[PDB]
Amino acid sequence: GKAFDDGAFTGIREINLSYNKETAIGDFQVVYDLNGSPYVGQNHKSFITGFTPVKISLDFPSEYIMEVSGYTGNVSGYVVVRSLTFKTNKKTYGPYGVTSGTPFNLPIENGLIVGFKGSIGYWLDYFSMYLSL
Amino acid sequence: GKAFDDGAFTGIREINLSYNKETAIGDFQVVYDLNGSPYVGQNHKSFITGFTPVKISLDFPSEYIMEVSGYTGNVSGYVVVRSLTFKTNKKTYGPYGVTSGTPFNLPIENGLIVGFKGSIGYWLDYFSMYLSL
Amino acid sequence: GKAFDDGAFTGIREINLSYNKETAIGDFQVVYDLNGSPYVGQNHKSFITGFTPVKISLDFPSEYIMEVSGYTGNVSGYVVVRSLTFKTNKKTYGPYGVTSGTPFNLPIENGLIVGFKGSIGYWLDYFSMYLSL
Amino acid sequence: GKAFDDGAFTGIREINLSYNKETAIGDFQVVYDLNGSPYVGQNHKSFITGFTPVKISLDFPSEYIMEVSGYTGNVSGYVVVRSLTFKTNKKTYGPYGVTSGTPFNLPIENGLIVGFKGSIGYWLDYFSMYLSL
Amino acid sequence: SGISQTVIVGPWGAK
Amino acid sequence: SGISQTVIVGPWGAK
Amino acid sequence: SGISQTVIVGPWGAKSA
Amino acid sequence: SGISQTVIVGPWGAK
Ligand SMILES: CC(=O)N[C@@H]1[C@@H](O[C@@H]2O[C@H](CO)[C@H](O)[C@H](O)[C@H]2O)[C@@H](O)[C@@H](CO)O[C@@H]1O
Ligand SMILES: CC(=O)N[C@@H]1[C@@H](O[C@@H]2O[C@H](CO)[C@H](O)[C@H](O)[C@H]2O)[C@@H](O)[C@@H](CO)O[C@@H]1O
Ligand SMILES: CC(=O)N[C@@H]1[C@@H](O[C@@H]2O[C@H](CO)[C@H](O)[C@H](O)[C@H]2O)[C@@H](O)[C@@H](CO)O[C@@H]1O
Ligand SMILES: CC(=O)N[C@@H]1[C@@H](O[C@@H]2O[C@H](CO)[C@H](O)[C@H](O)[C@H]2O)[C@@H](O)[C@@H](CO)O[C@H]1O
Numbered sequence: 001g002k003a004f005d006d007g008a009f010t011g012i013r014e015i016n017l018s019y020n021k022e023t024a025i026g027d028f029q030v031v032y033d034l035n036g037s038p039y040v041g042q043n044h045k046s047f048i049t050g051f052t053p054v055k056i057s058l059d060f061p062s063e064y065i066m067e068v069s070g071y072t073g074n075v076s077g078y079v080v081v082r083s084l085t086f087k088t089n090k091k092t093y094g095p096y097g098v099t100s101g102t103p104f105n106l107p108i109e110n111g112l113i114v115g116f117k118g119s120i121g122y123w124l125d126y127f128s129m130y131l132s133l
Numbered sequence: 134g135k136a137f138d139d140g141a142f143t144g145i146r147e148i149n150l151s152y153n154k155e156t157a158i159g160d161f162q163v164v165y166d167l168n169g170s171p172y173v174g175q176n177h178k179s180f181i182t183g184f185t186p187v188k189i190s191l192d193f194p195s196e197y198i199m200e201v202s203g204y205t206g207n208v209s210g211y212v213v214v215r216s217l218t219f220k221t222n223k224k225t226y227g228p229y230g231v232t233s234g235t236p237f238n239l240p241i242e243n244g245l246i247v248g249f250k251g252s253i254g255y256w257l258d259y260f261s262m263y264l265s266l
Numbered sequence: 267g268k269a270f271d272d273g274a275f276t277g278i279r280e281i282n283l284s285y286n287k288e289t290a291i292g293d294f295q296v297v298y299d300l301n302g303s304p305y306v307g308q309n310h311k312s313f314i315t316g317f318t319p320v321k322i323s324l325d326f327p328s329e330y331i332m333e334v335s336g337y338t339g340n341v342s343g344y345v346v347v348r349s350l351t352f353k354t355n356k357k358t359y360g361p362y363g364v365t366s367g368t369p370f371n372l373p374i375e376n377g378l379i380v381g382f383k384g385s386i387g388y389w390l391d392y393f394s395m396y397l398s399l
Numbered sequence: 400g401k402a403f404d405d406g407a408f409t410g411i412r413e414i415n416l417s418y419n420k421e422t423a424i425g426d427f428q429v430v431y432d433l434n435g436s437p438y439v440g441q442n443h444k445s446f447i448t449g450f451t452p453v454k455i456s457l458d459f460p461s462e463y464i465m466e467v468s469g470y471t472g473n474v475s476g477y478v479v480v481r482s483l484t485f486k487t488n489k490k491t492y493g494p495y496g497v498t499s500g501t502p503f504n505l506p507i508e509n510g511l512i513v514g515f516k517g518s519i520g521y522w523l524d525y526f527s528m529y530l531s532l
Numbered sequence: 533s534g535i536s537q538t539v540i541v542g543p544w545g546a547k
Numbered sequence: 548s549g550i551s552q553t554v555i556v557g558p559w560g561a562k
Numbered sequence: 563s564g565i566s567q568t569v570i571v572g573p574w575g576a577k578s579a
Numbered sequence: 580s581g582i583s584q585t586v587i588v589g590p591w592g593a594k
Contacts, residue, residue: 007276007301008568010551033550034300035273064549072575079576102236104574109261111539114551115301118573128242128572131264131539132551133532140434141538143406144581166582167433168406168514197581205545212546237544244569247583248434251543259545263538264569265583266399274553277564299565330564338560345561368502370559375527377586380553380566384560394508394557397530397586398566407585410534432535463534471592478593503591510554513536513585517592525592529585530554531536539569554586 001121004044008115008130009034013060016043017084018051019097023075024082024123026051030116033060044120056086056093063090065113068129073101080123134254137177141248141263142167146193148219149176151184152230156208157215157256159184163249166193181255189219189226196223198246201262206234213256267387270310274381274396276301279326281352282309284317285363290341290348290389292317296382299326310386322352322359329356331379334395339367346389400520403443407514407529408433412459415442416483417450418496422474423481423522425450429515432459443519455485455492462489464512467528472500479522 009032018027029043058064067087072079082101085094111131118127142165151160159179165172191197200220205212215234218227244264251260275298284293292312298305324330337349348367351360377397384393408431417426428442457463469483481500484493510530517526 005301008551008566010273011549035271036550058549061549070574081575105237105544106239106571106574107542107544109540109542110537111264111541112549112551114568117570118575124575126573126575126578128570128574131244131541131569131571133537133539138434140409141536143583168404191581194580194582203544214545238574239541239544240572240574242570242572243567244571245581245583247538250540251545257545259543259547261540261542261544263540264571265538266567266569276566324564327564336559347560370503372505372556372559373589373591375587375589376584377530377554377588378564378566383555384558390560392558392560392562394555394559397510397554397556397588399584399586407583409536435535457534460533460535469591480592504559505588505591506557506559508555508557509552510556511534511536516587517590523592525590525594527587527589527591529587530556531585532552532554541571556588 001047001119001125003119004042005117006030006032006041006115008132009039010036011060011112011114012065013038013058015056015086016053017096018053020051021098023098024080025084025097026120026123027053028116028120028124032115046120046122048122054096058088059090063088067105067107068113069103069105070095071099071101071103073098075123078122078125080125081127134252134258136252137175138250139163139165139174139248141265142172143169143247144193145198145246146171146191148189149186150217150229151179151186153184154231156231157213158217158230159253159256161249161251161253161257165248177253179253179255187229191221192223196221200238200240201246202236202238204232204234204236206231208256211255211258213258214260267313267385267391269385270308271383272296272298272307272381274398275299275305277326277378277380278331279304279324281322282319283350283362284312284319286317287364289364290346291350291363292386292389293319294382294384294386294390298381312386312388314388320362324354325356329354333371333373334379335369335371337363337365337367337369339364341389344387344389344391346391347393400518400524402518403441404516405429405431405440405514407531408438409435409513410459411464411512412437412457414455414485415452416495417452419450420497422497423479424483424496425519425522427515427517427519427523431514445519446521453495457487458489462487466504466506467512468502468504469494469496470498470500470502474522477520477522477524479524480526
């Protein structure tokens with residue numbers, strides 16, 4: 001797919017992703033906080049369309065992600081991120097996509113997710129997260 | 134189990150743990166680096182005996198852990214960490230214990246593991262890691 | 267004067283300030299780096315005019331500030347920053363302004379200046395710096 | 400002078416220093432906090448003796464240093480730190496030594512001092528501070 | 533307070 | 548609590 | 563270098579290397 | 580390397 005790297009910001013205000021209940025995660029766009037002001041990140045899009053869009057709007061500053069979990073598995077021969085779940089200190093958003101394959105989870109006791117990087121082709125191939133205090 | 138929290142240090146020099154190929158991880162001890170000097174961490178000991186010792190000696194400063202993975206599973210009704218694997222930029226140590234259950238993994242693109250906290254009863258119940266630049 | 271706070275960023279690419287060889291530092295503006303992209307900071311202007319502008323264009327990523335120094339003194343009844351000098355790993359920019367008063371300096375052995383905050387009336391009243399690895 | 404570098408810790412619990420009303424700062428020893436427990440640092444001593452000892456005991460984790468100030472100046476042909484003052488969120492400790500020469504100060508709006516390094520010959524030649532969140 | 537912080541991830545295991 | 552922090556040193560100049 | 567750094571964990575998904 | 584870093588400001592005193 002096409003690699004992307006948003007870099008690090010001040011926090012997260014909103015996450016816009018898309019998925020298909022039969023395949024995996026497709027598009028991914030984040031609205032970050034940048035020193036108290038919203039910063040609209042690039043919308044990293046799939047090479048194909050036909051996904052279901054989802055908007056996760058957080059009550060920034062009080063609400064923040066405490067755990068990110070999901071599943072990775074094969075779709076048409078490619079290992080991709082099939083599902084994503086975001087758990088904040090207020091609610092659990094998810095699961096979006098297909099909860100099949102091998103699980104992964106990143107719970108955070110202290111610190112914040114302040115950015116994302118990864119790659120997306122037909123689907124979200126892989127991703128990493130920037131962590132900070 | 135009994136909770137423990139070593140705190141944060143400058144780096145990791147050696148890890149001493151014990152395991153049983155039929156159950157799970159037992160004892161856990163770390164020799165950290167504290168501003169250039171080895172810091173002998175407290176030995177967090179299982180409530181029971183019968184484990185096999187393993188000493189993971191790293192070529193601190195050039196060698197450092199890049200990924201920690203393992204499995205969490207059911208043993209006698211208790212959910213514990215059954216296996217652990219440490220991957221450094223030089224070699225893979227493990228798997229130690231039983232590779233059965235639900236997998237988990239923490240790969241690091243940038244940063245260092247500088248401390249451990251968790252709980253150990255008969256076996257390692259759970260654990261968390263301190264990360265820093 | 268009027269307070270400003272640019273917040274924190276990824277680095278510094280250019281500093282645009284103005285001074286008067288008879289009084290003190292006037293205008294102050296910074297072009298930061300925001301994850302690889304130039305971020306044009308707001309131009310914090312003096313309430314008056316008559317200043318000589320200066321453009322400090324750093325060879326970002328290889329060049330970065332290692333020491334900030336200057337002089338604070340009394341100008342027309344106000345304590346303000348009369349002079350400023352920026353030293354990088356490649357060159358020394360300045361002194362700009364009047365080298366009169368009480369000198370101050372902030373040398374950095376490890377880390378980076380990633381943002382500025384302060385206040386400006388007729389002149390630069392005071393300022394602070396965000397530091398990060 | 401003989402260089403020293405304590406490295407970084409979790410916080411500061413007590414500072415022991417000595418001075419001579421006619422020269423400058425002589426000895427320097429810090430008792431740091433290391434993950435909730437006291438860590439007695441090396442006592443960095445002057446090449447000579449005849450100094451007045453001072454102990455600054457802070458009510459560690461409620462009390463912490465917010466500003467370090469002092470004076471640097473010549474003593475017998477050498478630039479040294481002649482005086483130091485420690486301002487916390489509760490009280491001001493000092494000035495200790497001779498308040499003569501050029502003043503300097505490091506105010507901290509956000510962050511903590513977690514370590515010291517420097518050099519001491521007959522007197523404290525210079526010093527730097529480790530800062531962290 | 534005067535206690536320095538560090539990022540901490542986990543935990544993994546039982547809860 | 549959800550906003551990232553940064554070390555800040557200063558003011559230098561008018562108190 | 564003059565680029566600020568941050569801790570980065572991952573990647574999860576397809577093998578990158 | 581495997582050695583953790585932290586911001587360091589200074590020296591104040593003799594260059
Ligand atoms: C040409 C292209 O981008 N194809 C996409 C796939 O990308 C390839 O992915 C593998 C791993 O699965 C490896 O990294 C190759 O180098 C890379 O070109 C992949 O992104 C899939 C699933 O999203 O879509 C395209 O086929
Ligand atoms: C008395 C004791 O500590 N027993 C240990 C177990 O601990 C119990 O664990 C559960 C969860 O699995 C829960 O936290 C209970 O409150 C706690 O007492 C557990 O640590 C096991 C496995 O290591 O060993 C002892 O039995
Ligand atoms: C109205 C105004 O902002 N005037 C500017 C001065 O500001 C005053 O500054 C003092 C300190 O020196 C204190 O903060 C007063 O409340 C404030 O009004 C000052 O910024 C000067 C020098 O730049 O310019 C104007 O006079
Ligand atoms: C030999 C020795 O250590 N002398 C001490 C002085 O050290 C010299 O210091 C200068 C700077 O002022 C420079 O670094 C030189 O190379 C050093 O030898 C100095 O520390 C002085 C004041 O404390 O005491 C002498 O003992």
